[PDB]
Ligand binder design. Sequence first.
Ligand code: AMP
Lengths: 337, 226
Amino acid sequence: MRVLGIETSCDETGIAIYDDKKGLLANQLYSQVKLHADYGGVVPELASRDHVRKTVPLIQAALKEAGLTASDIDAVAYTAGPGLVGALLVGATVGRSLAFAWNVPAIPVHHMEGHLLAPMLEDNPPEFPFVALLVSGGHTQLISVTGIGQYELLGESIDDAAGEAFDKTAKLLGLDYPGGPMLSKMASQGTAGRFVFPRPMTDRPGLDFSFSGLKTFAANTIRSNGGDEQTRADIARAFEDAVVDTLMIKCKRALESTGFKRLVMAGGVSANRTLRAKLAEMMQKRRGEVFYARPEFCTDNGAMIAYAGMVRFKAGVTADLGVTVRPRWPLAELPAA
Amino acid sequence: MRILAIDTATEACSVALWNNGTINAHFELCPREHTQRILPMVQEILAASGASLNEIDALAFGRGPGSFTGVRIGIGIAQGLALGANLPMIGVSTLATMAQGAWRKTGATRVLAAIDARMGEVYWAEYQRDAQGVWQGEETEAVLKPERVGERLKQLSGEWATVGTGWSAWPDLAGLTLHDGEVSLPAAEDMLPIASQKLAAGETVAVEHAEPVYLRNEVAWKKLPG
Ligand SMILES: Nc1ncnc2c1ncn2[C@@H]1O[C@H](COP(=O)(O)O)[C@@H](O)[C@H]1O
């Protein structure tokens, strides 16, 4: 079985072809970073216009990449939400009308489920049950996964998600939007323990998060110190170490509470080098296991949508002729499979 | 020939099919329901004329201008269908489509098309039908302030029919002899004679070349300091 996946929820056009026997057959990606950088954030109108010029050519390139023709595709999967209504609508209208024209089922996919299931694309995929740490731009959640579509929210952030906290501090460190990865590169040249940032919500028990106060601590530290590269790299490292220690403490607590032996990390922030090593080390001590997506499948791609689309198609999730986008769509609201 | 036309650039949802002259059409006001109504309308108009999507010779689409969202719904749906069925595509101006509608309804050969774009500006065009039924004046398509339109009306002469929501938004814009064109919104059935002329001239594009015509290309965001 072959599923074509379409991802256009934010600033990246992702097209992929996933075969449940042979694995990933094609993976195409166009990033709009340079388009939005100058505005310091994604301009919805500019993002929507760019998905229009890249969706159809990238579908055409993905088919020629995998050396397949139209009839080799059994279903079309597209991100229906959450995301930007304007960007979502590009992939959803192209995706649904393509499925109609090819006379194949169309699969609306939840973008966060896409991220969550991205580690299922690697060898030795996680078995249920597992604790999932979803660390994205807008969300930071601890989820109890007991099956596919069986997601129990254990904890979430009350303010900034870990990803936006990374972007906000990177802006203050003079980096271009989105600065999260560049902050992490700066941090790798940093001196351990030079500065010590707090770990919010870790004094009291509970699984909820808070990162807004790290932005303020960072801002005040930048102002109270010199502007040399080494100082800024030491602040970048102190910020990263605090976010990772916080995420590690909360993951530990969730594993204890649930009683689970498996931990899965997903979302853009799960690409972080320091987070991957610290969570790996903790699971080795617990005598458990960590599961990650490859770094490219941590951020927006179409492979996770073609994969999650295939799982939903096997469970009976099909779209009617009406196209529907859900810019606000909670992971808890999605039905169990 | 067989031509399928679709339009969602404005507050209306419309589809139409041309089969060597005979036309089957459907039009409806679908505010906030564009994505919910377009593919059921396509499936129904094809089933009605017993036509298969694979037998279509050209897919005509509302290229704009109009609602940015609406124009992108129309191009998205048309691109998926054309890519899926390997169909040549024909972009038809929403301004010229309303001119054709005014001619079909009133016999008007000289049309002043104005769409009420947000921010108090209008999408403007001066369209004149020639002896061959071709609407001339595509180079006049622009986004203008009503004051600039009023100045432009002083430069024109004769009898004109008015079409579009621009005249609803600014009815005090109406030296010239103006008549109501009886068209506020485009219909896909009025795209079919324009698409038929374009297909005959070999002026079709492949799916990857289909582009929207927004006219307003200015961003409603300032760039970061310096
Ligand atoms: N290596 C990294 N370290 C920290 N944050 C990252 C890294 N790579 C991506 N991100 C962040 O992850 C987010 C993008 O992922 P997402 O919202 O899950 O699609 C942004 O907030 C990025 O700054």
